[PDB]
C-alpha cells in the first residue's frame, strides 16, 4: 500500500518510499561482472555486482552503465539494477507496492513499454506509473508551468512545461553533464601539476568538484581576479592528510556548461539552450517560462549557477521581461521528491496503471 519511487539516472539510482522527503537508497547505476573465477573470503561465487560494491570491486570486474544519456540501453543489466534496488537496497517485495518509475524527456515509446512489461511480468508489481523526470522536478517546486534545466551525470535537458504538459517539440538535449565536468577537472588539475594515477587518487576528483567548484558570475573578470590575488584559492585535504590548493580550476570546471568548447564540444551552452527552448514555445506563454526557470539535478548544485543563468538569460530576453531562476536547496533529489509527492497525492490515485489493466491491454 506504500508506493515506491525509483528515479533511474545515467550515474545514480535514487530510490525510496512515496511520502518520504528524500530517497533512502542512492547508489551508482552500474553493473559489474567478474572477469575471472574466484571468491571473496567467506563468500560464494557471484555472477554480478551492482552499485557501490561494483564500484569498490571494479578492478576484477567488467563494468556496464545500463543508462546512457538518461535512456535505458541494456535491459538485462537494468533488470539487475531494479532487482538490487528492490531486494537489497529497499528490502521490499515489489509485488506488494505500486511503483512509480521516471524516464528521460523524449524517451521512445517502445522503451517505456519495455519498462512497463518488465515491471509487471518480471517483478509482478500491482500497479505502476512512468513519469518524465523534468516534470517531477517542476512539481517538486510547487509549479505546474515553467521551464526546467535538469543536469545530472550524463545528460542535460531543457524542458518547457505548460500546465503539466511537457512540450516535446521544444525540449533541448545537451550531452554534457557531471561526468564530463569531473573528467575536465581531472584534466586541468593535471595541467596545473597535480597527478591522479591510482583509482583512489582519481575518485577524489569528483569530491573536489562537489566541494570546491563554483560558477563565476563574470568568467573573464574572475580569471583576472584569480591571477591578481590569492583570494579565490581554496584548500583540499587529501585522505592521507596532505593539503592541496586550487584557484581558477574551481570555476573553470563548471564554466564548461556555459562554454562547451572548453571540452572541445561545438554546442550551445546551457543559457542558450534555455533561451532556444523558450523561443520554440508560443510567444504568449514565454513570460511564464522566463519567470519560472527551475534548476534540477546534481550538476546544477554549483554555487553561483542561478545568478549566472539569471544574468545570461537577462541578456538574451526582451529588455522588460521578468526573469527568475528557482534553484531549490534539495535539487540534487528534485526529480525523486516530485515523484514522492505525486505518488502520495489522493488526486493521483486513479492514474496508476494496474496489472489488471495491463493484463487486458497489451
Amino acid at each position: 500500500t506504500t508506493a515506491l519511487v525509483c528515479d533511474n539516472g545515467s550515474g545514480l539510482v535514487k530510490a525510496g518510499f512515496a511520502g518520504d522527503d528524500a530517497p533512502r537508497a542512492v547508489f551508482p547505476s552500474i553493473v559489474g561482472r567478474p572477469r575471472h573465477q574466484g571468491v571473496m573470503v567467506g563468500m560464494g561465487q557471484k555472477d554480478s555486482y551492482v552499485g557501490d560494491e561494483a564500484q569498490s570491486k571494479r578492478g576484477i570486474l567488467t563494468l556496464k552503465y545500463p543508462i546512457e544519456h538518461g535512456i535505458i540501453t541494456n535491459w538485462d543489466d537494468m533488470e539487475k539494477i531494479w532487482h538490487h534496488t528492490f531486494y537489497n537496497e529497499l528490502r521490499v517485495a515489489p509485488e506488494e507496492h505500486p511503483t512509480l518509475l521516471t524516464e528521460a524527456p523524449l524517451n521512445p515509446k517502445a522503451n517505456r513499454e519495455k519498462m512497463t512489461q518488465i515491471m509487471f511480468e518480471t517483478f509482478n508489481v500491482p500497479a505502476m506509473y512512468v513519469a518524465i523526470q523534468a516534470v517531477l522536478s517542476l512539481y517538486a517546486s510547487g509549479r505546474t508551468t515553467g521551464i526546467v534545466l535538469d543536469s545530472g551525470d550524463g545528460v542535460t535537458h531543457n524542458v518547457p512545461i505548460y500546465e503539466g504538459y511537457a512540450l516535446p517539440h521544444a525540449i533541448m538535449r545537451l550531452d554534457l553533464a557531471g561526468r564530463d565536468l569531473t573528467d575536465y577537472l581531472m584534466k586541468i588539475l593535471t595541467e596545473r601539476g597535480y597527478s591522479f594515477v591510482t583509482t583512489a587518487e582519481r575518485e577524489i576528483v569528483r569530491d573536489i568538484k562537489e566541494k570546491l567548484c563554483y560558477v563565476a558570475l563574470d568568467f573573464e573578470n574572475e580569471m583576472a581576479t584569480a591571477a591578481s590575488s590569492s583570494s579565490l584559492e581554496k584548500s583540499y585535504e587529501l585522505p592521507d592528510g596532505q593539503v592541496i590548493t586550487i584557484g581558477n580550476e574551481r570555476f573553470r570546471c563548471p564554466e564548461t556548461l556555459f562554454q562547451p568548447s572548453f571540452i572541445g564540444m561545438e554546442s550551445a551552452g546551457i543559457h542558450e539552450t534555455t533561451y532556444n527552448s523558450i523561443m520554440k514555445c508560443d510567444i504568449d506563454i514565454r513570460k511564464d517560462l522566463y519567470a519560472n526557470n527551475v534548476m534540477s539535478g546534481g550538476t546544477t548544485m554549483y554555487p553561483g549557477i542561478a545568478d549566472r543563468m539569471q544574468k545570461e538569460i537577462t541578456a538574451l530576453a526582451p529588455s522588460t521581461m521578468k526573469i527568475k531562476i528557482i534553484a531549490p536547496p534539495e535539487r540534487k533529489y528534485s526529480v525523486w521528491i516530485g515523484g514522492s509527492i505525486l505518488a502520495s497525492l489522493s488526486t493521483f490515485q486513479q492514474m496508476w496503471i494496474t496489472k489488471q489493466e495491463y493484463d487486458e491491454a497489451g
Binding site: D20, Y139, G142, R143, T144, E163, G164, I341, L345, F348
Partner: peptide, 22 residues
Amino acid sequence: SDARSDLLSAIRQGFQLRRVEE
C-alpha cells in the same frame, strides 16, 4: 472541474513529506 484540474491544483498546494533522517 475535472480530475486533472484537481490534480494540478493539488500539486501546487504541496504535500507534507516525512523526514528521512541521515
